[model samples]
Target: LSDEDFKAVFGMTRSAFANLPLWKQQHLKXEKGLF
Candidate 1:
């Protein structure tokens, strides 16, 4: 994706994750060992 498009998509994804409950978000990160 172009830089602007990528940024837009990333922002949307970030917002989606932000919308999740905190516990679920933490669970997902733990499952992926993303940190």
Candidate 2:
């Protein structure tokens, strides 16, 4: 997914992204190619 897609997936607010469940955060990181 693109950067815009990820932001949309997590809502426009970055706070919402951080607010996601721990497991989901980890999952997203890997799928999003974090680090």
Candidate 3:
């Protein structure tokens, strides 16, 4: 999915992303890359 599309589906925002804890963001990024 495009970044916008992902955000639409998941209700995420760039600002929200920036606020995510490093470990959680890293885990999510890794999981998304694997899919």
Candidate 4:
């Protein structure tokens, strides 16, 4: 994982991540190997 791309400044909770659109979540999960 690149591990350096996100500038996201806040900590995330798990259920909050579930709020993301399904495609968006998959993209993050795969493209990023991430989140």
Sort by lDDT, top down from the best? 3, 2, 1, 4
Write candidate 3's Cα lDDT for 1-35 as tens digits. 78897697446887787699988877777777743
> Which of 2 and 4 is ahead in TM-score?
2
| Cα error, candidate 4, residue 35 (Å) | 12
Model 2 over residues 1-35: C-alpha lDDT tens digits? Answer: 67787676655456677788989878887886663
Across 1-35, the per-residue lDDT of candidate 1 in tens digits comes to: 56566445444466576788999878876875656
Q: lDDT for each of the candidates?
A: 0.67, 0.72, 0.75, 0.54
Report clash pairs, candidate 4.
none
Q: Tell me how far the alpha carbon of residue 11 in candidate 3 is from the true structure, in angstroms, after superposition.
A: 4.6
Clashing pairs in 3: none
Which residue runs of candidate 2 sit more than 4 Å off their true CA positions? Answer: 1-12
Candidate 4 structure quality by residue, lDDT tens digits, 1-35: 12232234213445555787889767777764556
Q: Number of clashing residue pairs in every model?
A: 0, 0, 0, 0
| Model 1 segments more than 4 A misplaced | 1-12
Task: Output the lDDT of residue 31, model 4.
Answer: 65
User: Against the true structure, what is each candidate's TM-score?
Assistant: 0.58, 0.52, 0.58, 0.47
Tell me which of candidates 3 and 4 scores higher on TM-score.
3
lDDT comparing candidate 3 with the true structure: 0.75
